[model samples]
Target chain A: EVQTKHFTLKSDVLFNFNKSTLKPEGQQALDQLYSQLSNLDPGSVVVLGFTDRIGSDAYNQGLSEKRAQSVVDYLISKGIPSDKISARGMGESNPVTGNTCDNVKPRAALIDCLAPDRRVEIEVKGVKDVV
Target chain B: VQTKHFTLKSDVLFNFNKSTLKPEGQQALDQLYSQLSNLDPKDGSVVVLGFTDRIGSDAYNQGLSEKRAQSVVDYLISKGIPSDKISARGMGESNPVTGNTCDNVKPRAALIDCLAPDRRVEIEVKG
Candidate 1:
């Protein structure tokens, strides 16, 4: 049977403001993630990037792609095989906050309210060892 | 043991006020069985529960729900699942998912459509 493990990381924890470069703290988070990889006989890893609805669609799409690739690159450096992993960027799609932030006022407040939307989702597909 | 709960809309599985499974319902159950196949066979049990909207008398709804649930259980058994490992129960008009949202829809057809979420068969698989 194929099992899947999903991990969601906040973009703020992973990169600087509007930047794709991994922060020092981001590496720590990924290092912690590496420890959990032993739980599965992993077959494929899909890294997905998303952005909040504050930017232009085109700009957000590029930013999302860069963010996803940054994570993919870091994972490879941490010993995840390149062939076993891939990245995809989904710009301003599937907001977790829904309309909760719609009525929120001020740009900064809206940004904070939509923080959950700016995220990187990793899906590890494989099977756990049978007991 | 881990348990998973799945909901299948009753409108998709049976005609209104009926208990027999439609052909599409059989196909849906086939897909459900494929998921059940992944579980440890010796350690799993399935429970089929039937529910109805608040449009009918309690006695009638209860009996109808029971018949519906029994139909689903029998179908699962026919699909090669162990009969001893599965059971069925009727919840009647209880535990509605629609709450009071459908209360103000005065027209009968619109009311039925509004209460669609309440009419369902919920399957629980524990392993």
Candidate 2:
């Protein structure tokens, strides 16, 4: 069965160490994903970007938006209507890691452990499987 | 010339060590031809290569590999892939995909399954 769903791509898979630009491997992943996205309506699709806790709030927030925009840009190039695509972002990552109580500059080891926070999620709200 | 190789498990293509093409083998080739239509045009050369498990004698393995390779090339030609663009070569037990680890395994069936990865065919396309 196919329906509106979420496709959360690990930011590391699509970007450099911490930048918004995509690498060759990232482009290839997006290319393969384009076919899967074809069934969804860009008008209802959301490209939500995210980032880790290392950067300042303001810096991370803007970076998140830019990350989301980069993905939208690629989708646009592949015939997904540009204007209708919803692109947005936030500073916090999900599946919020193990240390939820003590929030401060995580130790070097902990910082590396929370890498999942840096990611992008494509939420399509329609009758299409977003695999 | 740009060359691309498509590799498939031998069990999927033939029965035991025989050369006759099974129905499933024909189906696999039919599906594989789709990849060739655009990537492998008429000017390209399709080399059907085959291999076998290390259990058989050197000569017996070589014969099986050769026949299977020929069958694959024949099927491609039948499907309108110009004869000149297709060829076949079978390198028997000479080229093994796995180390001789089956010696440690018990039972013939289990050993064959373990070394199944070694018995396979690889289609090389050069254009």
Candidate 3:
């Protein structure tokens, strides 16, 4: 049976504004995530990167790709199997919160309002022996 | 166990406030049986759960759901499927998946259609 695990990393917590480089806090979060990863049997790890609607698809896609790749690379260094992980970037195509911002703007307030759109979602599926 | 689910819109299966299977519903169920004919039900099981829209009293709705589910279960058995591997249950109006936020009751055709999604039968197969 395939059991699933979900983990989310905030974009602001993971990277500086609009940047793909991981901050120290982001590294700490990843370290915390590694502990939780041990609970699953490690069949497959899906790393999905997403960005807010602040940028165009071409730009957002690159940023998300770099971020996801960075997470996969770090996990590989942390002893997770490279073959068991797949990284993907969805740009602004998918949003946790709908694109229904009444006073839509690109300022800090708007970004904070749409914070959920910019993040990394990790899904791990595996078979468990116990209930 | 690995499992899969099939969602059937009950509006197409039976009429409003009725548990009896319609002719069109029988046609649909025949097609479904043909699709399930190849699946070996030895180590697997099927459950037909029925749900209804908010149309009547709670007790009435609950019985209607259970009767509808039983009707489907009986049909599956009559198709030469193993009766021991099938079961039925009712969910009443507990789970609503409707788009109409019917804040209050009304007698509108459109409202009934909006509530159609809530009135459904979900068949789950586990293996």
Candidate 4:
């Protein structure tokens, strides 16, 4: 019997401040993630990106999409088949942080408070054949 | 008694395909919404915009910002406020869509499925 495992990656290290380029730390982190996925060999993997409500809605949506693609690109570069990976951006629609940063003051302070909201969730599924 | 009214706007009419410009339809819609806001002479207004999951992450973020800014500009042009009167831009974190449309086929179909989520909501505060 073959079992499957799921790997989760965070966007904290994946993205820089107000920039889409991934940092060295992010690459290193992805390398670690790659090792985990390689071990699972799941038939399919879904990579979803999320962002905090710091900027405009459209901006966050776009940022989330780019970040998600970047992760997919990293996985592909590391030898993960393109067909095996599904990447999508959720933008700020689903926030890990509670709704409304209204109570929080200062943009930087709000970002720090909402850091957990900016994340990437990956799901892996194994295909099974029934006879 | 003091009451506040919030005006909501939609991005569908406001943005063109891969564009951030305010269309004539959008202007007409804003005008209608403005009438509602004018009734109360609000002290402040909060405008929030949202988008569906379509493109890359960073691009969506930038697009959302630009769209939101365009809304603000439209509002200002309609006498909502001066350039510096309002203090905000793009609010893409919120989605009105229920659950995920992952099962939907075709990219354009997916967008329609997620249309309700890709909307812009404006808040008007009055004293």
Candidate 5:
């Protein structure tokens, strides 16, 4: 049987504002994922990056791509084969905030409200070992 | 990335107020190990979590819970499960599944029996 598990980690937990470079704390979070991966005969890992709707579409897409690649690279360094993993840039395509942050005036408050939109979603697919 | 959770009655695993595993407990765990063996040999994680009924002080309950979980982990390791992948945790009297259902039960024996489900050890196998 095949099984898939999806994990969503907030970008706030993984990067600085508008930055694609992972922070030390971000690496720690990824370490936990690595630990989980070690427990599975994982087939494929898809890391999809997203951003809030504040930036230009082009800028957001590039940032998302870089961030996703960064995560893919780190996972590779942790022993996940590159062939088994890939990255995708969702950009501002999937805004989880909906209209929740539209009424918020302050840029900072709006950013906080849209935090859910800025995230990295990792999907792991594998076969269940049921001998 | 699937987690299979197995809940075993603490009563079957040990005598009341004790942490050592009885023969019956070993048999139960042996069956559990059979399922675990299906997972990757060098991979996967197993977490043994111990919990208790709210019949005792927090410190006492916590200590017993920890010992019970440790005993299970030790037994699993003895049966050739990887030490690195298996660990133990004590949740004490927290997260009672019985909730308020056992609150009105009178008589010490009745209360203990009613709270039977609260005293449990859960094994989680993530693969």
Candidate 6:
């Protein structure tokens, strides 16, 4: 059955201590992902970047955008048509796990609660041909 | 003259509103970095993933490891020999800006001052 495939590249994979550049490991992961998608023969792919609610809303939003751009750049380098892929960054606006940061005692605990909130998700969708 | 290239795959590139794994964008960036490195003909590459002091002392250390692993996988996918790659996660122990944990002592300002702490740095070598 030809269906959609979703992949999430965690924030830990791409960035490193106080840096916004792509590490060698990050690059390797992406390469593997592309090789997989290329074999899948998907129609289109969407790449979304996200950040936790740790920093300012504005800063997070900007950071998200940059992260998205980084992904787009990588796909393009791998022979994936730019038009076939799209990227977006949603700062800490959406929460995957609620009550994790609200009125939660101990900031560390709250951060941990929201651990699920930090990640990147890619959705690959394809339209099956009708014979 | 030949030179080495090091790239940082920003955390922003991966993950979504809530998820973990390799996002499409993250994959793409990794592919690109590999392409660039392959052109350099390096002897080996070092992929270091780091985490900030936002989380608990222990959790930060673990987060750092996962981050490092993610980067290493990306390099291998790009055709780099597994043996040629080394990955490590350095928690918020190292601080580039003062007034932070390793340097200064504060809270919010400390976090802001130590923004550099939340990044992944890749080092490549050529022989």
TM-score of chain B of each: 0.94, 0.88, 0.87, 0.53, 0.94, 0.50
Candidate 3 lDDT tens digits, B1-127: 7655556668878987788888767765765565466467558788999999877699999999999999999988898767998999998987675433654546677767557657888776776
**Which ranking of candidates, highest lDDT first?**
5, 1, 3, 2, 4, 6
Model 4: how far residue A11 lies from native, Å? 2.0
Cα TM-score per model: 0.51, 0.48, 0.50, 0.46, 0.52, 0.47
Q: Predicted candidate 3: what Cα RMSD to the true structure?
A: 14.8
lDDT of 5 by residue, A1-131 (tens): 56555566789989998899999989987976676567666489899999989879999999999999999999999999989999999999866555657899789898877776888988788777677
Model 4 regions more than 4 Å off? A1-6, A99-102, A128-131, B1-127
List model 2 lDDT by residue over A46-121, tens digit each: 8988887776888888888988989888877887776657789776644334353245454876566666566777
Over the stretch A23-127, how does candidate 6's per-residue lDDT look in tens digits? 787887787667656765447777887788887989888887778788888888998898888888888866555443578768878766566566666767776
Selected candidate, larger lDDT, 1 vs 6: 1
What DockQ does each prediction reach against the true complex? 0.02, 0.02, 0.05, 0.01, 0.05, 0.02
Docking class of 5: incorrect
Model 1 off-target regions past 4 Å? A128-131, B1-127
lDDT values for all models: 0.83, 0.73, 0.77, 0.58, 0.84, 0.58
Off-target runs (Cα >4 Å) in candidate 2 are A1-131, B40-42, B100-103
Model 4, span B56-113: residue lDDT tens: 4656755665565565556554654544434445545443332344335557756554
How far in Å is the alpha carbon of A36 misplaced in model 1?
0.7
Task: State each candidate's chain A TM-score.
Answer: 0.94, 0.79, 0.90, 0.84, 0.93, 0.84
TM-score of chain B of 6: 0.50
Which parts of model 5 are misplaced by more than 4 Å? B1-127
**Cα error of candidate 6 at position A113, Å:** 2.9
lDDT of 4 by residue, A68-125 (tens): 8888898899988988887888888755444445588787788777775777777566
Worst 10 residues of 1 chain A by lDDT: A33-42
